[PDB]
Design a protein around this ligand. Structure first.
Ligand SMILES: CN[C@@H]1CCc2c(ccc(O)c2O)[C@H]1O
Lengths: 282, 230, 331, 52
């Protein structure tokens, strides 16, 4: 009773915080025309992904945990899973796109204005969501992701129970498409950006003989990794070895991954312009 | 009456398409302001490259240098127009430490301080060219005129350990001029804009490459400081 | 001898002005009712410039307006339907002023280059390119379709004839580079103010300066002229905007607040003259009760400094152009 | 150049002046007389307003 009440309170606070932060950043971008910028379109895409997260898959999963069973229909189990995968992969790929945009802005400043335009920004944002949809809705709404052993068939036949059972192929493919490839891209581009920042710091020191880069990249990489790496590692493991990972650990790591959507406004919208916009909004 | 509205909408669409093309053209190029004294030798630099504009490109990047001259006024208010420029190129003669037309160097330092300490030019970086190094070397090497009389602070100055030299005395003088400019550069700024002191002679033809590199550094540092990376 | 005589005569001018001020404007004004709060909402936002806007001019018809920016374009707007009627490419990327001819046939622009260009809309080719100034132009106005007055970065303000392209008269005797200019609604008189803290009234026909007003402390950036033709308000880099009177020959009221420490870039008057709208260096512009000298409202919708402000002839709307690309029309 | 300045100041000296009370009264009378037909001063009706 008290233990369940605590989980309910924590999940309610989490969903409230996620929704509030994401609607705040979205309405700040929408209301003020100064915030509208090529990178802010990617920020808006990420905020929309986190908002649909907090609206659809956080409270439904909270109900699925607090109450033992899935009251809603089996089709709605499939739809909730599809929306969850869509939101996760869209958020991670949008983070990768933002990292790529920063890398292009810093590495090739002269051509950066040509490479990234409003029309190209819209094309990239739609392409990200198209990839996310082809990753999530296409294999899950249809019966591709369903496993073959007896447990998966029993779970999928019963309408009251809604859990996650997945083929090796789809588990590996979803993990690679969602996290590991964006992880590689983001790590590479941020290593290049850190090298450029260190080079400029050395140039300034050499010119004016009379730290900051480490903290920013540190938090940007650390939050995303500490939120999502354990879940995707156990996503690989639980199908590489069936008995390795228990269900409760898997769900807990999945929710720690969900928590990342709340932290995105704090990391990617701390600029003084955003601070002034938030002050004006409230 | 709806026909007039439709025709006006078509004209608006055509004008908007032309404006988009002009935006693609305009956002690509970079605009520079050339700002120096008349005797500084800016003519030499602009040649190697009421208002004079020069279109010079390098590495497929279009630079637009707007040298303003003939509007010789102590009060410069057209300077507020050059708030969106990539950089302000400053040309100063470093061989004029003893010319009163107080000294030319002191007038140039006052101009540099006024430009640096401008509310509108807070974010604009200044590329500094210390022209006429050969004449300065000839003047200091002769020893007829000593900087100590015109600049008392030249005394008690030793050559910086981290220096890239040539005669020791002329190098002392050159780095004194650089430090005199860089003190004004660093005292007021908060990291938004920097100064890039370059030593140029009338013979040097690589100033285009130097301006290209300095503009690249300026935009790179601007992007790095827009984020918390620097 | 001559300098001492000039100093004594300036003392006499000051004494004569002081002897004519029995009571201030606020003493008489404070009895009448205040204007009250004024709420103004951005009805239409004009988009399409690429760089900062310096000046605009409402057409004689309340709809059309023309604005120029450092982009290098002179866009003519249809404020009723928000459609770019014309977009004129410019020879020089830098422009400091605009002008809409009373007939609507011609449009003039001035740049940081010493040359102003007059465009024939109904024909968008350069009808005439007027040169002769030795400094940047700050403001241009149209008397008729053939006579144009320009104020430049030298001392002189000049009156041109477009057909012959010649400086008919030169208004000299000023001290600093002229930054503002305005015309009498029907009379030949016009006024101009510059960096020296002095706004001078001129006579177009005679070509001489009748009166000079030196109330301000810093450079004057804008002048609007009262609809009566018997007053004009100046804006300076000090926070004060001041209302001068031609017949009294000295200032009547000052518009400033302790909180505001930024300068004023453009001022204008309401059609009844009660509301002195002033555009400040901070990102918003303010509305003053020209009689009570107290603030009536504020217009805060701009992301950068308000470089130009104007009120249409009918008085329906106020359009302000800031250093961001957007023109905003308030009402 | 001082001769031109002193001549201009002398020309400015011989101009008639009216008391500030009269000028302020004229300005107040004008602002009262033209107050009614000011769209900015009195919020215009939505039907009469062209922009909105
Ligand atoms: C039920 N929750 C889902 C299940 C599997 C999965 C998630 C997120 C991203 C992916 O690429 C996945 O394959 C999780 O949020």
């Amino acid at each position: 009773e008290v233990w369940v009440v605590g989980m309910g309170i924590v999940m309610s606070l989490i969903v409230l915080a996620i929704v509030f932060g994401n609607v705040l950043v979205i309405t700040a971008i929408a209301k003020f025309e100064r915030l509208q910028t090529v990178t802010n379109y990617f920020i808006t895409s990420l905020a929309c992904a986190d908002l649909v997260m907090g609206l659809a898959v956080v409270p439904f999963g909270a109900a699925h945990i607090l109450t033992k069973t899935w009251t809603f229909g089996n089709f709605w189990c499939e739809f909730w899973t599809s929306i969850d995968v869509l939101c996760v992969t869209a958020s991670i790929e949008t983070l990768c796109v933002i990292a790529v945009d920063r890398y292009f802005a810093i590495t090739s400043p002269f051509k950066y204005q040509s490479l990234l335009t409003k029309n190209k920004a819209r094309v990239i944002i739609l392409m990200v969501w198209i990839v996310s949809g082809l990753t999530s809705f296409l294999p899950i709404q249809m019966h591709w992701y369903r496993a073959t052993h007896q447990e998966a068939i029993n779970c999928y036949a019963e309408e009251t129970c809604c859990d996650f059972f997945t083929n090796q192929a789809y588990a590996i493919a979803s993990s690679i498409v969602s996290f590991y490839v964006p992880l590689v891209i983001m790590v590479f581009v941020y290593s290049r950006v850190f090298q450029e920042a260190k080079r400029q710091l050395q140039k300034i020191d050499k010119s004016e003989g009379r730290h900051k880069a480490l903290k920013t990249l540190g938090i940007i990489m650390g939050t995303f990794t500490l939120c999502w790496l354990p879940f995707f590692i156990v996503n690989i493991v639980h199908v590489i070895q069936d008995n390795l990972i228990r269900k409760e650990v898997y769900i807990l790591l999945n929710w720690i991954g969900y928590v990342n959507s709340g932290f995105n406004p704090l990391i990617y919208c701390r600029s003084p312009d955003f601070r002034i916009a938030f002050q004006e909004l409230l | 009456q709806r026909n007039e509205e439709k025709a006006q909408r078509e004209a608006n669409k055509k004008i908007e398409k032309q404006l988009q093309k002009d935006k693609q053209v305009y956002r690509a190029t970079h605009r520079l302001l050339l700002l120096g004294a008349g005797e500084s030798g800016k003519s030499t630099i602009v040649k190697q490259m009421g208002i004079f504009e020069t279109k010079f490109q390098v590495d497929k990047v279009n630079f637009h240098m707007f040298d303003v001259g003939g509007q010789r006024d102590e009060r410069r208010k057209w300077i507020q127009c050059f708030n969106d420029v990539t950089a302000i190129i400053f040309v100063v003669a470093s061989s004029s430490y003893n010319m009163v037309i107080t000294n030319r160097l002191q007038e140039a330092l006052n101009l540099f301080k006024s430009i640096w300490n401008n509310r509108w030019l807070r974010t604009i970086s200044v590329i500094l060219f210390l022209n006429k190094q050969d004449l300065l070397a000839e003047k200091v090497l002769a020893g007829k005129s000593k900087i100590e009389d015109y600049f008392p602070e030249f005394a008690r100055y030793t050559t910086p350990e981290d220096a890239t030299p040539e005669d020791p005395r002329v190098t002392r003088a050159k780095y004194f001029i650089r430090d005199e400019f860089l003190r004004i550069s660093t005292a007021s700024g908060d990291g938004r804009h920097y100064c890039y002191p370059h030593f140029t002679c009338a013979v040097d033809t690589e100033n285009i490459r130097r301006v290209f590199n300095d503009c690249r550094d300026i935009i790179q540092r601007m992007h790095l400081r827009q984020y918390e990376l620097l | 001898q001559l300098r001492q005589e000039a100093e004594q005569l300036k003392n006499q001018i000051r004494d004569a002005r002081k002897a004519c001020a029995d009571a201030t404007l606020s003493q008489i004004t404070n009895n009448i009712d205040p204007v009250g709060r004024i709420q103004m909402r951005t009805r239409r936002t004009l988009r399409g410039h690429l760089a900062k806007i310096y000046a605009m001019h409402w057409g004689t018809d309340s709809r059309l307006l023309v604005s120029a920016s450092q982009d290098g374009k002179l866009i003519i707007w249809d404020s009723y339907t928000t459609n770019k009627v014309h977009a004129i490419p410019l020879r020089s990327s830098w422009v400091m002023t605009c002008a809409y001819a009373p007939s609507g046939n011609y449009v003039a622009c001035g740049g940081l280059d010493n040359i102003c260009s007059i465009y024939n809309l109904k024909t968008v080719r350069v009808s005439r390119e007027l040169a002769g100034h030795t400094g940047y132009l700050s403001c241009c106005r149209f008397l008729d379709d053939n006579q144009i007055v320009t104020s430049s970065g030298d001392t002189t303000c000049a009156l041109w004839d477009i057909e012959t392209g010649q400086q008919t008269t030169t208004f000299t005797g000023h001290t600093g580079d002229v930054m503002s200019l305005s015309l009498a609604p029907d009379t030949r008189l016009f006024v101009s103010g510059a960096c020296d803290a002095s706004a001078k009234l001129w006579d177009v026909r005679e070509g001489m300066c009748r009166q000079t007003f030196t109330g301000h402390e810093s450079d004057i950036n804008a002048i609007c002229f009262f609809p009566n033709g018997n007053a004009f308000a100046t804006g300076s880099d000090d926070a004060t905007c001041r209302l001068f009177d031609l017949r009294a020959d000295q200032e009547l009221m000052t518009y400033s607040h302790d909180n505001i420490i930024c300068g004023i870039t453009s001022v204008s008057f309401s059609k009844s003259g009660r509301l002195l709208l002033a555009g400040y260096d901070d990102f918003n512009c303010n509305v003053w009760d020209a009689l009570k000298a107290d603030r009536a409202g504020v217009l805060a919708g701009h992301d950068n400094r308000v470089s130009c402000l104007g009120v249409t002839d009918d008085g329906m709307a106020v359009a302000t152009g800031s250093w961001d690309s957007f023109l905003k029309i308030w009402n | 150049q001082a001769r031109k300045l002193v001549e201009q100041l002398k020309m400015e000296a011989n101009i008639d002046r009216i008391k500030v009370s009269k000028a302020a009264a004229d300005l107040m009378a004008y602002c009262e007389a033209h107050a009614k037909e000011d769209p900015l001063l009195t919020p215009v009706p939505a039907s009469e307003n062209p922009f909105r």
